[PDB]
Amino acid sequence: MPYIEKLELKGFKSYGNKKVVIPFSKGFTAIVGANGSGKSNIGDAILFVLGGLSAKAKYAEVAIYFNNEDRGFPIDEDEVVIRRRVYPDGRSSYWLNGRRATRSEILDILTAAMISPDGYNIVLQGDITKFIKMSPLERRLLIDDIS
Amino acid sequence: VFMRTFEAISRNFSEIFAKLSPGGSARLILENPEDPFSGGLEIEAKPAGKDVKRIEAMSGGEKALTALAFVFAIQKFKPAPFYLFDEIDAHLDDANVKRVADLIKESSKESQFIVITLRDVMMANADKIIGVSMGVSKVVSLSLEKAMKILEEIRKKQGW
Numbered sequence A: 001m002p003y004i005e006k007l008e009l010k011g012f013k014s015y016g017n018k019k020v021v022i023p024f025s026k027g028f029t030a031i032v033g034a035n036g037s038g039k040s041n042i043g044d045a046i047l048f049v050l051g052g053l054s055a056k057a058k059y060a061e062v063a064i065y066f067n068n069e070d071r072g073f074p075i076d077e078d079e080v081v082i083r084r085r086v087y088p089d090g091r092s093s094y095w096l097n098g099r100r101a102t103r104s105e106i107l108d109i110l111t112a113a114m115i116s117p118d119g120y121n122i123v124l125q126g127d128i129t130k131f132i133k134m135s136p137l138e139r140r141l142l143i144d145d146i147s
Numbered sequence B: 001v002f003m004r005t006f007e008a009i010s011r012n013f014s015e016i017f018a019k020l021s022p023g024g025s026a027r028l029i030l031e032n033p034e035d036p037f038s039g040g041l042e043i044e045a046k047p048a049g050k051d052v053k054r055i056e057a058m059s060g061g062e063k064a065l066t067a068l069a070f071v072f073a074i075q076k077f078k079p080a081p082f083y084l085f086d087e088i089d090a091h092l093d094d095a096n097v098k099r100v101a102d103l104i105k106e107s108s109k110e111s112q113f114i115v116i117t118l119r120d121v122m123m124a125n126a127d128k129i130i131g132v133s134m135g136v137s138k139v140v141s142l143s144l145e146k147a148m149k150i151l152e153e154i155r156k157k158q159g160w
Helices: A040-049 A103-112 A127-133 A136-146 B002-020 B060-077 B094-107 B120-125 B144-158
Strands: A003-010 A020-023 A028-033 A060-067 A079-086 A092-096 A099-101 B025-030 B041-046 B082-086 B112-116 B128-133 B138-142
Touching: A003 A040, A003 B112, A020 B128, A020 B138, A028 B120, A028 B144, A040 A060, A040 A079, A040 B082, A040 B112, A079 A103, A092 A103, A099 A103, A127 B060, A136 B002, A136 B041, A136 B060, B002 B025, B002 B060, B002 B094, B025 B060, B041 B060, B060 B094, B094 B112, B094 B120, B120 B144, B128 B144, B138 B144
Parallel strands: A028 B112, A028 B128, B082 B112
Antiparallel strands: A003 A020, A003 A060, A060 A079, A079 A092, A092 A099, B025 B041, B128 B138
C-alpha cells in the first residue's frame, strides 16, 4: 500500500496565501506544536482533500502527493496528486495529477488504494471519545459492517 | 462470517492490550454469543492488580488505552497505507505512552504513521519531526534537539 510524500496547503484555515509544504517520512513522522498553532488543521486539510465533505487568494486549496511506486492506486504513474480548491461562493473542484476530476471519481480512486476519509486509519480528536462511549450495540454493528 | 471477523479482531485486541498494558488482559465479549445479532459487544479489561471491568467503569487513562487497543485491533484486521493520529496519547497515563510509541515505531517498518503529539517518547522514535507554529501557521522539519526545546517551551505554557 502506497504512501504520502507531502501535503501542500494554500489559503486553508490558518494556512495563508504563501503556500505551505508539509513533508512526511515514508515511515514515522511526529508533528509538534502548541494548542492553536494550526497543527489540528492538518487533520482537517486531510479530511478535506480526501473527500468526506461534499460542497453542499480567494480559494482554499489542499493538495496531497502520494508515492505510487507500488501501484496501490489504479494509475500507472509513480506519483498521484489529489488537489481540491474551495471557492467563496461554496463551489468545490478537484484535479488528479493536473486534470479535472469529480469527487465521486476521487473517492473511487482512494477506495481502490484502500483509503477512505471515513477509514479507521484516521483517528482525530473526538474519535477516541467515540470508541469509549459507543453503546455495545453500535460496537457490534461496526464489526458487522467490517465483516 | 461475522464470527470469523470477530475472532480475528478479538484476538488482535487481547494481544495488543496485553502488549500495551503489561500483566493485563482484556476481551471483547458478545452479549449474546448464541444469537450475536440480537445483542451488543462489550469490552472487558483488566489491568494488573485490578478486577475485571467494563470500559465505562475504568479510569480516564484506562478508558483511553482500551479504546486505543480496540482501534489498533480493527486497523490490524483491515490495514491502510497510512495512519494519521491526532493526539491519541494525550489522555493516556505516562507508563502507557512508551508502549504505544514502541508499537507504532514497529508497525511503521511496514506502514506510514503521522502522529500529532506533545510527548518526548513519541518524538524520539520518529523518522522525522515537523514543528508547527502560528493568524498564520508555519511548518518546519526539526531535529530532536530543537524539537525537544520547543516541547519543553510548550509544556511550560500549557501543562498537562
